[model samples]
Target: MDINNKARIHWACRRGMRELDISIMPFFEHEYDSLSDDEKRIFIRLLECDDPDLFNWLMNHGKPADAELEMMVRLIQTRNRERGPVAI
Candidate 1:
């Protein structure tokens, strides 16, 4: 799970709203280790997005222009689905 300092990545996922935390954190935790280095890099790029944009992207209101980001967004959605009880 060399997803580059797991604790720091968790800190990066923490945001201004419960929605960001719920969607982003668990994906990083459960799915991150399974991703390719390039994919993981893209996940970091996803984190760079500001709150509203990331929220919209994850919430399916906005799709990212980059394919890597788009894939990560979908993957997060899948992770959320497999988990339990998500409103959005």
Candidate 2:
């Protein structure tokens, strides 16, 4: 777990907002391990963004200017939808 610095990223996933929490933490727990090194890098970079921006991106109200970040955000959105319907 400590290897490859995932343990550090695990803590960063805790954004202290339920919207970001559900979108990020579940993906980190369930999908992070499967991502290639490049995707992992992009995901880690995504964590550095502010919570407000993350909310907009995760909610699809806005898109990240960085294509890689947008890709990761979409991946999270699509995968979470596959888990089940979200309450409105």
Candidate 3:
């Protein structure tokens, strides 16, 4: 994927974290501390995905019973579509 796309995802992740009241670095520190190395890798990949791709993937792959995760996916999808694709 393009570097611009990667940057866009990074920005979107930060924005989402803010809206969720999650402090990015501190949250990662606490969260990653308990995760196994493999789980950490998956988490990183999830963070790296562009908003639209990540949202769609989550909606399709994530359990509907996970209400919080589903809600987040929807939020990301809404924001991403509203923003449209942009140049970095």
Best by TM-score: 2
| lDDT of candidates 1 onward, in order | 0.83, 0.88, 0.45
Best prediction by lDDT? 2
Q: Candidate 2: how many backbone clashes?
A: 0
Segments in model 2 whose C-alpha atoms lie over 4 Å from true places: 1-3, 85-88
User: Which window of 10 residues has the lowest lDDT sum in candidate 1?
Assistant: 1-10
Cα misplacement distance, residue 86 of candidate 3 (Å)? 38
Q: Candidate 1, residues 1-88: lDDT per residue as tens digits? A: 2358778777888888889888888888888888888888778888878899888988899798988889989988887788867575
**Model 3, 1-88: lDDT tens per residue?**
2222434434544634333323333344334445455544444555654555444444465533444444444544454444445767
Q: Is candidate 1 or candidate 3 better by lDDT?
A: 1
- Give the TM-scores of the predictions, in the order they appear: 0.84, 0.88, 0.36
Kindly report which residue pairs in candidate 1 clash with one another: none
Better candidate number, 1 or 2, judged by lDDT: 2
